[PDB]
Structure formats: structure tokens, C-alpha cells
Design a protein around this motif. Structure first.
Motif, PDB file in Angstrom:
ATOM      1  N   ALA A   1       0.824  -1.208   0.000  1.00 45.36           N
ATOM      2  CA  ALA A   1       0.000   0.000   0.000  1.00 45.36           C
ATOM      3  C   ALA A   1       0.860   1.262   0.000  1.00 45.36           C
ATOM      4  N   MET A   2       1.966   1.246   0.743  1.00 48.25           N
ATOM      5  CA  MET A   2       2.885   2.384   0.748  1.00 48.25           C
ATOM      6  C   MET A   2       3.478   2.606  -0.631  1.00 48.25           C
ATOM      7  N   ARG A   3       3.980   1.529  -1.240  1.00 47.28           N
ATOM      8  CA  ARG A   3       4.538   1.620  -2.586  1.00 47.28           C
ATOM      9  C   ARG A   3       3.532   2.219  -3.560  1.00 47.28           C
ATOM     10  N   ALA A   4       2.273   1.765  -3.495  1.00 45.54           N
ATOM     11  CA  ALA A   4       1.248   2.279  -4.396  1.00 45.54           C
ATOM     12  C   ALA A   4       1.000   3.762  -4.169  1.00 45.54           C
ATOM     13  N   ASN A   5       0.990   4.194  -2.910  1.00 47.45           N
ATOM     14  CA  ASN A   5       0.812   5.620  -2.632  1.00 47.45           C
ATOM     15  C   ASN A   5       1.941   6.446  -3.234  1.00 47.45           C
ATOM     16  N   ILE A   6       3.180   6.021  -2.995  1.00 46.89           N
ATOM     17  CA  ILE A   6       4.334   6.772  -3.484  1.00 46.89           C
ATOM     18  C   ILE A   6       4.321   6.825  -5.006  1.00 46.89           C
ATOM     19  N   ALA A   7       4.057   5.684  -5.643  1.00 44.98           N
ATOM     20  CA  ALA A   7       4.016   5.626  -7.101  1.00 44.98           C
ATOM     21  C   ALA A   7       2.958   6.584  -7.654  1.00 44.98           C
ATOM     22  N   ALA A   8       1.770   6.597  -7.043  1.00 49.14           N
ATOM     23  CA  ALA A   8       0.730   7.518  -7.481  1.00 49.14           C
ATOM     24  C   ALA A   8       1.182   8.965  -7.323  1.00 49.14           C
ATOM     25  N   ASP A   9       1.796   9.292  -6.185  1.00 48.87           N
ATOM     26  CA  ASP A   9       2.180  10.679  -5.926  1.00 48.87           C
ATOM     27  C   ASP A   9       3.293  11.142  -6.856  1.00 48.87           C
ATOM     28  N   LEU A  10       4.145  10.227  -7.306  1.00 49.39           N
ATOM     29  CA  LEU A  10       5.260  10.568  -8.186  1.00 49.39           C
ATOM     30  C   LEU A  10       4.943  10.316  -9.653  1.00 49.39           C
ATOM     31  N   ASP A  11       3.717   9.897  -9.965  1.00 49.06           N
ATOM     32  CA  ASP A  11       3.331   9.546 -11.335  1.00 49.06           C
ATOM     33  C   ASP A  11       4.287   8.505 -11.910  1.00 49.06           C
ATOM     34  N   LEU A  12       4.565   7.472 -11.113  1.00 45.75           N
ATOM     35  CA  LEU A  12       5.413   6.352 -11.507  1.00 45.75           C
ATOM     36  C   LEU A  12       4.620   5.048 -11.543  1.00 45.75           C
TER      37      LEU A  12
END
Ligand SMILES: COc1cc(NS(=O)(=O)c2ccc(N)cc2)ncn1
Ligand SMILES: COc1cc(NS(=O)(=O)c2ccc(N)cc2)ncn1
Ligand SMILES: COc1cc(NS(=O)(=O)c2ccc(N)cc2)ncn1
Ligand SMILES: [Mg+2]
Ligand SMILES: [Zn+2]
Ligand SMILES: [Zn+2]
Ligand SMILES: [Zn+2]
Lengths: 160, 160, 160
Positions: free
Chosen positions: B114-125
């Protein structure tokens, strides 16, 4: 190609009586050794995590449990080799590794070259793409009191 | 292009009663939470610092003052997204992020994806360019005693 | 070229009354200073180690011993310049440097531009390829009690 990725790794283990001190695959004469699953090689673990991190594959805890029959007795060089295998499986090639050991004692300088050679062999890399540095902690904290040894690592890979 | 840059980040916050525990944007059930002026999200702050650092834009304190009332309880994902916006405005694209959380407790493995998904969304990655690792400190120091949680991060960017 | 390499660096020094505080080549008024061979510049040492590491040339201890008459009376900026010369001779161009200072006090933000200017001059780099960040340790550990100061560094180089 040009699809480079960076990874960073961290590990620490307690120094305890009655176990050999093994760092970078090198057995170092010392009255204590690192506490962990098998050889507790803090340097190889930090590099392993940096490589998993660069390939976005998670970490040691996601890959290597105490209970997998393939890895039950495995020393940390076998696990580093498996790590490198999974990095390649994901389509990445390793470009370089750098690392730091933090230990107040014993002196690690006599052993650095052998560590570098071990890592280079396990990662199928030439020596000039592997680096190991060694520091004290200036007698600060649990590292400075000799209660544990820390390792840090950085790795560059590329997706070909 | 080939104008790559690397950045690195560090953060730590005390673990105290009566605060939400928010790491990587995830609200984790726990009797204690991290103390800070913002929501105290130690993982996102470390990543934020790594991104500012790769772009040579300073650090999170320069961009989002720890004493500015507008940031009391701030959502650190919103801060991460504004960091990414400024890094893009400086001309950089993000290529990957790797990170480590160091905590005695709670168990973070159930929350990492869930953390990885949040970071990826926030960085458009995409998810395959974002990595989160979770370790204990092997019972050593204030981290071993559960007095705080540390995060480390590394980021690769390229100026387009 | 495309032959990028990454390096990472760590340093720590004790902070006690009776010595000046010199970080990134900047003398900072304070009731305590860092203990070391000469100026004890923890930030420049970490960057030096990151640069040797990216070039796979070892570390500070391998290059600059305390007893060597060529460097016995050398400050850490002279060491950083010699490090950069050796990295150049080994075939590597420096692409960027990022770093973090962890100190509970004094406040270092007013001095960041001066540190960046010193580091960029010593590395013959454009200012926008050098970054310095500064954090407290949230009153945790020997850093949080003001007993030492730590520096972390990352460096990207390319073999030409
Ligand atoms: C589990 O995450 C770890 C563990 C570790 N060292 S260890 O507990 O000795 C260990 C545990 C399991 C395996 N498969 C190998 C070693 N170091 C870093 N991260
Ligand atoms: C100030 O440098 C920091 C602060 C911090 N956390 S914080 O004090 O909760 C905070 C306060 C305000 C904002 N806008 C963001 C974070 N973590 C890392 N470096
Ligand atoms: C020797 O490895 C070090 C040393 C150090 N600082 S130091 O012991 O004051 C020192 C020692 C020798 C020289 N030439 C300069 C400084 N910091 C980080 N790594
Ligand atoms: Mg630490
Ligand atoms: Zn380990
Ligand atoms: Zn923070
Ligand atoms: Zn030093």
C-alpha cells in the motif's frame, strides 16, 4: 540501455560471544561474531537489499524466509548469488556496488580486498565495479561501544 | 537524456502515544504514532528529501517550513506531490525511488504494498519503479527500544 | 559516456566544547566543535568517501593516512580536491553530489549556500550539481543529545 536504477541498503547485527565474525564472506579473528540466522554477514545483507531495491524487488524479508528448504542452511554468499540471479531474472544488469562497514573493532583494513573479491565473484563483476569502505563510529552509540556492526550499500543497475 | 542525478534522504521521528501512525501515506493501527509538526510521515519525508536533493533544490525544511502554521498536521503525500511538481518544474523526470523503514514495531510487511502504491501515485510512476524495504534495528539503540522510526531513501532523476 | 557509477559516504565526529565547528569548509560559531585529526569536517569527509566509492578507489583511510607527511597538515578541502584529482585520473567525471548533515544544533540553514559554494569549487562543478541538506535527529540518540554530528553523501560519476 539507458534505464538506470539506484538502490540503497542498510543492515545491523549484534556482536555476541561464541560465533565467528564473518563480513563480506571473510572470517575475521575476533572474540565475538555477528548474531543472526546463519553467518549474519551484515555487509552482504546490505548489498543484497540495495540490489533488490534497485530492481524494485522488495527486500531480504520478502525473498528469504527461515523456512524455505532451498535456503535453510544457506550462508550469505549463496543468498547474495540468489539475489543477483533474481535481479537478472527481472531484466537488470548490475553496474556497480559501493558500501561502508561501521565497526569500532576489529580493524577491517587487512580484510577489505578479500571482501571486494568475494562480492565481485558472487555478482559476476570485475573488481573495479565493487567497493568496500570501513569506518569506526568514533566511540558513539551502540556501534562505538562495540555492541554491533552496521553496513550501508548503494547499487546501480540498468534494465537491458 | 543522459543527464542523470542521484539524491539521498534521511528522516526520523519519535514514537509517542496519542498520534496517528502514518507511514508511506498509510494509517497503520497502533497505540502510538509519530510526533511531528506535520503528520510526521517519516518515509515520505525521506523520499521528499531525496528528490529535492537529486534536483539540487535544497531540502524539505527549505520548501515547507517546520514552523509554518499552514503545515500543522500537513498531509505528507500532498507535500510529496508538490515536491515532485517542483522537481519537474526544475526540468527533471523521476526514474526510480528506493527506500528503507527501520522500526521495532508494528509489523510493516502487511502495509508495504500500500505504501509503494501511494508513493508511485504521488510521483506519477508505475509500481515497478518504486521500492519500500522494512527492517528492524536488531534490538540496538533507540530504534531497538521502539523510541522512534527511521527512514532512508535514494532517488534517480534525469534532466530532460 | 553511459558508464555511470554511484558512491555513498558516511562520517561522524564527536561534538564537545573546546574545538571549532567546521562543516563544509564553513566555520560556524558554537559552544562545541568536532573532534578529529585536524578540522574534522564531517560533511567533506562523507563526500570524499562517496567519490572514492563511486570510482571504486577505496576510502579516505586508504588514501590519506594521519601520518603521511604530504597530508599531515592538510585541511579537509585540500583532501577533497586531491580526491577529485584522483577520481579524474581514474577516468571518471563527477555528475552530481547530494548530502545530509544531522546535527541537533546549531541551525545550519544560513550556511548551506557557503558549503555548496566550497564543495562545488573544490570539485570543479556547477553549483546546481551540488546539494547539502541539514536535519536534526528529533532529540533521539547521541546525535539528538548533541554529542556528535553525522554526515551522509551520495555521488554520481561517469567513466569517460
Ligand atoms: C529478514 O531480513 C533481514 C535479515 C537479516 N539477517 S538475518 O536475520 O541473519 C537473516 C534472516 C533470514 C535470512 N534468510 C537470512 C538472514 N538481515 C537483513 N534483513
Ligand atoms: C523541517 O525538516 C524536516 C521536517 C520533517 N518533519 S516535520 O517537522 O513533521 C514537518 C513540518 C512541516 C513540514 N512542512 C514538513 C514536515 N521531516 C524532515 N525534515
Ligand atoms: C580515516 O578515515 C576517516 C577519517 C575521518 N576523520 S579524521 O580521523 O579526523 C581524519 C583522519 C585522517 C585524515 N587525513 C583526515 C581526517 N573521517 C572519516 N574517515
Ligand atoms: Mg544511523
Ligand atoms: Zn542481516
Ligand atoms: Zn519528518
Ligand atoms: Zn571525518
Amino acid at each position: 540501455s539507458m534505464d538506470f536504477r539506484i538502490g540503497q541498503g542498510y543492515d545491523v547485527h549484534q556482536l555476541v560471544p561464541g560465533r565467528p565474525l564473518i563480513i563480506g564472506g571473510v572470517t575475521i579473528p575476533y572474540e565475538r561474531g555477528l548474531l543472526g540466522h546463519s553467518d549474519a554477514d551484515v555487509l552482504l545483507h546490505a548489498i543484497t537489499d540495495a540490489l533488490f531495491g534497485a530492481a524494485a524487488l522488495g527486500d531480504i524479508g520478502r525473498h528469504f524466509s527461515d523456512t524455505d528448504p532451498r535456503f535453510k542452511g544457506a550462508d550469505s554468499r549463496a543468498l547474495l548469488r540468489e539475489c543477483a540471479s533474481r535481479v537478472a531474472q527481472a531484466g537488470f544488469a548490475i553496474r556497480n556496488v559501493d558500501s561502508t562497514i561501521i565497526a569500532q573493532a576489529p580493524k577491517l583494513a587487512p580484510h577489505i580486498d578479500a571482501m571486494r573479491a568475494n562480492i565481485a565473484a558472487d555478482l559476476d563483476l570485475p573488481l573495479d565495479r565493487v567497493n568496500v569502505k570501513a569506518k569506526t563510529n568514533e566511540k558513539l552509540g551502540y556501534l562505538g561501544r562495540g555492541e554491533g556492526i552496521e553496513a550501508q550499500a548503494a547499487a546501480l543497475v540498468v534494465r537491458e
